[PDB]
Amino acid sequence: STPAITLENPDIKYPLRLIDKEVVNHDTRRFRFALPSPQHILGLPVGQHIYLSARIDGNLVIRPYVPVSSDDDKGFVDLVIKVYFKDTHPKFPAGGKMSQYLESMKIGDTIEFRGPNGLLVYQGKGKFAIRPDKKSSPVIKTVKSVGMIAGGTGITPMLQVIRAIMKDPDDHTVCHLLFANQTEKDILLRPELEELRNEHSARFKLWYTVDRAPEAWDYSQGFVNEEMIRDHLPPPEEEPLVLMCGPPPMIQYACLPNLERVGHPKERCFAF
Ligand SMILES: Cc1cc2nc3c(=O)[nH]c(=O)nc-3n(C[C@H](O)[C@H](O)[C@H](O)COP(=O)(O)OP(=O)(O)OC[C@H]3O[C@@H](n4cnc5c(N)ncnc54)[C@H](O)[C@@H]3O)c2cc1C
Ligand SMILES: NC(=O)C1=CN([C@@H]2O[C@H](COP(=O)(O)OP(=O)(O)OC[C@H]3O[C@@H](n4cnc5c(N)ncnc54)[C@H](O)[C@@H]3O)[C@@H](O)[C@H]2O)C=CC1
């Protein structure tokens, strides 16, 4: 028999109870929610995300988040979410709606989950099923290596895929991650990433850039650029899939032009 599935229907909302919150850094936390019983699984293909929804201040608010847990995990789901606080940034006095609602939840409070959703599914052993859009059937891309460019919380879909690969000893796909954040203290999930490197260095290449670097720094500095792509992702002739996820300007100005300069074609690139 197979475990009971939480997300049985993508149009149903499932209220899940918050059970734990763990600090990732000054503004980011892992939020762990209980599934309907301890034996359930979420029901989420690798590559997919969920949506959270709530009535915040009298208006329904819906936002997507990528679980970093998997269908191997019985009884819980983990999200890694950056909180955009009010009364902090001069351009954003109110902060972010959903992320502060989440930050304010008490353990035992519920929030509605729905899913799965997304254009990409990782089918294992280098196989990716990618829809060109939400109005098209998937096509299955088969690769030996995967470049991953993440900015900030854009790490979450990358980590979800990395974890899926590394746990299968017969999955020979090599992941090359280039992870960009504003400062060293903004790096998310660093111990794991470095733990994954320590354990799986033949399948996992790790590199960082930060917008402003500290004095003691052995990685790159600045926005993602041509040189970083050329040095820290597989080269075009090895026909990798290049996955990217981060702020819209990151994608538009740092990733797309520089991917084109290196020679990774559109049709081998995917933005979460
Ligand atoms: C498919 C998908 C999956 C996603 N998965 C994740 C995920 O796994 N983890 C995750 O954390 N996010 C994820 N996001 C983003 C997420 O959906 C929300 O957009 C995010 O949580 C912000 O929503 P909000 O309602 O808090 O902010 P909103 O109220 O919608 O917006 C406020 C915006 O103002 C800016 N802002 C406000 N206050 C500050 C501040 N103090 N400092 C800097 N900027 C500020 C930010 O740009 C912020 O997004 C994902 C996005 C997509 C498209
Ligand atoms: N589609 C998905 O599955 C997911 C999407 N995301 C998105 O990722 C983003 C994460 O935002 P934050 O963590 O707040 O990022 P952030 O604002 O802290 O920026 C992270 C990095 O993005 C790059 N970047 C930012 N502005 C740039 C610019 N003007 N030019 C070039 N590069 C720039 C920089 O390298 C920076 O260090 C959000 O937009 C979020 O919606 C997050 C998780 C998953």
Swiss-Prot record:
Coiled coil: none annotated. One of its GO terms (molecular function) is cytochrome-b5 reductase activity, acting on NAD(P)H. Changing H49K: Decrease and increase in Km values for Fe(II)-[cytochrome b5 and NADH respectively. Changing H49Y: Similar properties to wild-type. The keyword Lipid biosynthesis applies. The keyword Membrane applies. It is a lipid-anchor. FAD binds at R63, P64, Y65, V80, K82, Y84, K97, M98, S99, T156. Keywords: Acetylation, Cholesterol biosynthesis, Cholesterol metabolism, Endoplasmic reticulum, FAD, Flavoprotein, Lipid biosynthesis, Lipid metabolism, Lipoprotein, Membrane, Mitochondrion, Mitochondrion outer membrane, NAD, Oxidoreductase, Phosphoprotein, Steroid biosynthesis, Steroid metabolism, Sterol biosynthesis, Sterol metabolism. It is found in: Endoplasmic reticulum membrane; Mitochondrion outer membrane. The modification Phosphotyrosine is found at Y14. GO terms for biological process: cholesterol biosynthetic process. Its cofactor is FAD. Changing R63K: Km values for NADH and Fe(II)-[cytochrome b5 similar to that of wild-type. Pfam families: FAD_binding_6, NAD_binding_1. Residues 11-123 form the FAD-binding FR-type domain. One of its GO terms (cellular component) is mitochondrion. Changing H49E: Increase and decrease in Km values for Fe(II)-[cytochrome b5 and NADH respectively. Its EC number is 1.6.2.2. Changing R63 to A/Q: Increased Km values for NADH and increased dissociation constant for NAD(+). Component of a complex composed of cytochrome b5, NADH-cytochrome b5 reductase (CYB5R3) and MTARC2. Interacts with MTLN; the interaction is required to maintain cellular lipid composition and leads to stimulation of mitochondrial respiratory complex I activity. Catalyzes the reduction of two molecules of cytochrome b5 using NADH as the electron donor. Belongs to the flavoprotein pyridine nucleotide cytochrome reductase family. This is NADH-cytochrome b5 reductase 3. It comes from Sus scrofa (Pig). The gene is CYB5R3.
